[PDB]
Amino acid sequence: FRTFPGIPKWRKTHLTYRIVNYTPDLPKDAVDSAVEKALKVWEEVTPLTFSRLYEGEADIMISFAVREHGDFYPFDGPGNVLAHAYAPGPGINGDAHFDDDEQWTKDTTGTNLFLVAAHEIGHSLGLFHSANTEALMYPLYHSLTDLTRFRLSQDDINGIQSLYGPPPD
Amino acid sequence: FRTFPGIPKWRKTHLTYRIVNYTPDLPKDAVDSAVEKALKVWEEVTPLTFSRLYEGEADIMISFAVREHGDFYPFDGPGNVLAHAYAPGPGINGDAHFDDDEQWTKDTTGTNLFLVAAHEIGHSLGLFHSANTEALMYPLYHSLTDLTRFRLSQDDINGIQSLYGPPPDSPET
Numbered sequence: 001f002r003t004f005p006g007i008p009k010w011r012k013t014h015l016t017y018r019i020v021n022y023t024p025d026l027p028k029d030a031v032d033s034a035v036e037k038a039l040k041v042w043e044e045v046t047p048l049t050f051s052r053l054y055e056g057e058a059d060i061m062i063s064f065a066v067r068e069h070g071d072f073y074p075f076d077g078p079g080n081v082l083a084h085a086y087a088p089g090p091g092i093n094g095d096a097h098f099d100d101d102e103q104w105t106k107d108t109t110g111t112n113l114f115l116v117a118a119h120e121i122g123h124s125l126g127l128f129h130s131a132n133t134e135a136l137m138y139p140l141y142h143s144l145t146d147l148t149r150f151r152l153s154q155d156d157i158n159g160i161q162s163l164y165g166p167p168p169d
Numbered sequence: 170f171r172t173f174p175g176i177p178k179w180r181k182t183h184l185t186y187r188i189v190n191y192t193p194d195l196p197k198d199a200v201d202s203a204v205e206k207a208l209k210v211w212e213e214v215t216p217l218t219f220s221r222l223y224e225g226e227a228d229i230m231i232s233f234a235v236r237e238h239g240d241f242y243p244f245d246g247p248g249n250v251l252a253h254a255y256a257p258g259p260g261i262n263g264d265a266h267f268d269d270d271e272q273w274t275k276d277t278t279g280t281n282l283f284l285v286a287a288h289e290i291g292h293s294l295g296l297f298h299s300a301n302t303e304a305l306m307y308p309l310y311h312s313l314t315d316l317t318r319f320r321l322s323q324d325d326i327n328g329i330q331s332l333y334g335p336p337p338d339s340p341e342t
């Protein structure tokens with residue numbers, strides 16, 4: 001697994017999240033679930049907890065964009081870059097953006113929102129890419145068995161635990 | 170009645186529109202419905218017709234935004250600027266952006282999406298801010314606790330018809 005240089009990690013245990021907008025591809029509720037499960041998978045292996053904001057600046061701001069949005073790294077159209085997120089920090093950091101030029105799906109018939117969201121939140125928490133092919137942080141993300149047989153690899157667990165530790169309670 | 174500097178218009182009579190993303194404030198078909206009705210307002214008084222695209226580039230790309238969102242003018246936040254649209258033309262021209270930091274609503278409890286959208290798609294069709302106080306194109310979001318009976322003012326109609334003219338099937342007073 002890999003951790004960014006000078007291991008930037010959140011100082012606090014509890015983090016807030018906000019879903020800024022919604023994609024036309026899926027029902028709003030499907031988006032919420034994909035995100036809730038994406039956060040759930042990291043939450044159950046570390047002492048981190050999450051709560052949701054509907055206004056104000058949350059630590060992890062989540063949105064869907066196309067091409068040039070509010071940053072210096074515009075999206076590239078359908079395929080290739082599917083989404084990108086920022087390492088721990090104030091402001092733009094921690095935030096995760098998803099490319100709407102992709103077809104976000106509930107299953108594996110387009111770009112599965114769950115698989116990719118879990119990976120991106122990885123970035124938001126301090127994790128960089130892993131060289132292990134079976135790890136969630138391997139830049140293949142949606143190219144996995146999906147949650148029928150999906151399971152965080154011990155590599156992902158080791159990587160996030162090197163930053164925040166295992167669950168105490 | 171006031172128009173844009175240069176006076177741009179659309180050469181095509183039929184325009185396409187697309188809802189790029191959705192607001193967490195309202196359910197999906199509610200947003201859609203406020204947009205159809207905002208387009209109907211201008212159709213009734215001109216020979217302009219509209220169609221909805223679900224992919225690709227439509228003339229009027231409609232989206233909800235917050236602060237820096239990829240164009241020349243960032244949204245301020247929970248207040249003041251509620252939305253902004255671009256004059257007719259290619260690219261970002263003719264598009265409408267709605268400040269999501271506002272509480273979009275189907276009624277008068279927050280910021281009525283229909284009311285503002287009708288004002289914006291005025292901009293997307295070539296109208297600028299009016300001087301008349303009773304005109305939709307006047308830049309004042311009204312604190313009217315009445316909205317059930319909506320009508321385009323005569324100077325809105327006078328403005329949009331000087332760019333496109335009256336409907337072919339409508340008799341004139």
Ligand SMILES: COc1ccc(S(=O)(=O)N2CC(C)(C)CN(S(=O)(=O)c3ccc(OC)cc3)C2C(=O)NO)cc1
Binds near residue numbers: 250256284285
């Ligand atoms: C290019 O033509 C435009 C000129 C100014 C603006 S603006 O975004 O700067 N803003 C200027 C002003 C603060 C004077 C009023 N509001 S608004 O958001 O509060 C507004 C929005 C809808 C509305 O519908 C009744 C009335 C006011 C608008 C504006 O004009 N938007 O277009 C937008 C388009």
Ligand SMILES: [Ca+2]
Binds near residue numbers: 058061089091092093
């Ligand atoms: Ca942030």
Ligand SMILES: [Ca+2]
Binds near residue numbers: 075079081082101102
């Ligand atoms: Ca892409």
Ligand SMILES: [Ca+2]
Binds near residue numbers: 023024099101102103
């Ligand atoms: Ca999409």
Ligand SMILES: [Ca+2]
Binds near residue numbers: 259263
């Ligand atoms: Ca356009």
Ligand SMILES: [Ca+2]
Binds near residue numbers: 245246248249268271
């Ligand atoms: Ca505002």
Ligand SMILES: [Ca+2]
Binds near residue numbers: 194271272273
């Ligand atoms: Ca809102």
Ligand SMILES: [Zn+2]
Binds near residue numbers: 069073084097
């Ligand atoms: Zn981005």
Ligand SMILES: [Zn+2]
Binds near residue numbers: 119123139
């Ligand atoms: Zn990645």
Ligand SMILES: [Zn+2]
Binds near residue numbers: 240242253266
């Ligand atoms: Zn804008």
Ligand SMILES: [Zn+2]
Binds near residue numbers: 288289292298308
């Ligand atoms: Zn205006």
